[PDB]
DNA sequence: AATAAAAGCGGAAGTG
DNA sequence: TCACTTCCGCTTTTAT
């Protein structure tokens, strides 16, 4: 199946929803959601998953936090900002 | 000098 | 057993 962090990495590399999410330092692996448009991106994630209820950014960010222990995606001390690990990106 | 709003947090039970 | 999903309540950051 597809994992949340890959769903995000896909959009970022696609530019498919540049209005909702965007790199901050593509080299460092940091990215940021739009305060106004993040809910739309969260909705699309719930639909790709087919979940019973519609997906919200709150529930999505709740999922992201579980990646902290495993390292895929860590929270940056910047509003709506996260960071992919090197392994997720490449080498 | 306080607020309101938004963001961020995580335990617990639940779902394909 | 996974990878979240859903719910609920509390705390922190931010904007004014």
Curated annotation (Swiss-Prot):
Taxonomy, superkingdom: Eukaryota
Reported tissue expression: In the bone marrow, concentrated in hematopoietic stem cell, lymphoid progenitor, myeloid lineage (granulocyte macrophage progenitors, classical dendritic cells, monocytes) and B-cell clusters. Among B-cells, predominantly expressed in pre-B1 cells. Expressed in germinal center B-cells.
Any GO molecular function: cis-regulatory region sequence-specific DNA binding
Binding site for DNA: 49, 62, 65, 75
Membrane-spanning intervals of the chain: none
Cell location: Nucleus
Induction comment from the UniProt entry of this chain: Highly expressed in both FV-P and FV-A-induced erythro-leukemia cell lines that have undergone rearrangements of the SPI1 gene due to the insertion of SFFV. Negatively regulated by microRNA-155 (miR-155).
Protein's job: Pioneer transcription factor, which controls hematopoietic cell fate by decompacting stem cell heterochromatin and allowing other transcription factors to enter otherwise inaccessible genomic sites. Once in open chromatin, can directly control gene expression by binding genetic regulatory elements and can also more broadly influence transcription by recruiting transcription factors, such as interferon regulatory factors (IRFs), to otherwise inaccessible genomic regions. Transcriptionally activates genes important for myeloid and lymphoid lineages, such as CSF1R.
Associated clinical condition: Agammaglobulinemia 10, autosomal dominant: A form of agammaglobulinemia, a primary immunodeficiency characterized by profoundly low or absent serum antibodies and low or absent circulating B-cells due to an early block of B-cell development. Affected individuals develop severe infections in the first years of life.
Family, similarity comment: Belongs to the ETS family.
Protein name: Transcription factor PU.1
Gene name, Swiss-Prot/TrEMBL: SPI1
Positions spanned in the full protein: 169 to 259 of 270
